Amino acid sequence: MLNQELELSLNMAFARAREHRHEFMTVEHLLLALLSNPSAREALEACSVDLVALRQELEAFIEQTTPVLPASEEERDTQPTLSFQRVLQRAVFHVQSSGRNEVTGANVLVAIFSEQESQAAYLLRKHEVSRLDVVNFISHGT
Amino acid sequence: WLDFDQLDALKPPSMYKVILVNDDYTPMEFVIDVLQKFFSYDVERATQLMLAVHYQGKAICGVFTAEVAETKVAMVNKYARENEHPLLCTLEKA
Numbered sequence: 059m060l061n062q063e064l065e066l067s068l069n070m071a072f073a074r075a076r077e078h079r080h081e082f083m084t085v086e087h088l089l090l091a092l093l094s095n096p097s098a099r100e101a102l103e104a105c106s107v108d109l110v111a112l113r114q115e116l117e118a119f120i121e122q123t124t125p126v127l128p129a130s131e132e133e134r135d136t137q138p139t140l141s142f143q144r145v146l147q148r149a150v151f152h153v154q155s156s157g158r159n160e161v162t163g164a165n166v167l168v169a170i171f172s173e174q175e176s177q178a179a180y181l182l183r184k185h186e187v188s189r190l191d192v193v194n195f196i197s198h199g200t
Numbered sequence: 201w202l203d204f205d206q207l208d209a210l211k212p213p214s215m216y217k218v219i220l221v222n223d224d225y226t227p228m229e230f231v232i233d234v235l236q237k238f239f240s241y242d243v244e245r246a247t248q249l250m251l252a253v254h255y256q257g258k259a260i261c262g263v264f265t266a267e268v269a270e271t272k273v274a275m276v277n278k279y280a281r282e283n284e285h286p287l288l289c290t291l292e293k294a
């Protein structure tokens with residue numbers, strides 16, 4: 059089960075995207091939302107990430123590269139990218155493969171790294187964060 | 201709505217060209233439909249791109265991020281499949 063705080067993050071990310079008329083909800087919308095998700099935010103703070111700079115980089119990339127739906131079309135609305143779907147499925151898989159059920163924003167953060175052609179993964183690695191850094195924080199704290 | 205349950209040198213990911221390939225069965229009207237529906241082209245430009253697909257064998261519909269390109273390709277191919285046309289949509293590094 060995706061926990062309450064994760065569900066809140068996902069639903070608000072999707073709503074923001076819909077209000078801006080974005081054709082897609084991306085892994086970058088996802089990472090941007092995780093910055094204010096306690097579980098993922100804590101993990102990133104432990105990795106000494108400049109969250110103000112990462113926020114700006116994500117916001118700039120999202121508005122510049124995400125196509126916007128025409129003002130005259132109500133047959134099709136904001137959809138998740140395949141990459142976004144894979145990240146959620148992977149986070150659930152990783153948690154279940156450890157014999158557990160609760161999925162947090164930190165588990166979703168771990169799963170983002172496997173989308174190697176995503177800008178989100180690139181930015182995380184640019185900020186010196188590795189998949190293992192997050193997993194170590196989840197398992198052992200700071 | 202969406203159901204979230206059920207649905208060292210470092211370089212940035214590259215951009216991708218989204219391409220429409222020609223075939224002998226897909227009607228010109230459908231190719232134009234696809235260009236307007238999934239790429240937001242007006243009738244004029246959609247018609248020009250359809251002719252390019254027809255005469256050149258292929259045509260670039262747009263350039264997007266790897267993530268967006270992959271999704272657009274799947275959406276177009278799913279739409280062609282639902283309408284029973286062998287219209288092939290692909291992608292390649294820009």
Ligand SMILES: [Zn+2]
Nearest residue numbers: 074075078080
């Ligand atoms: Zn936006």
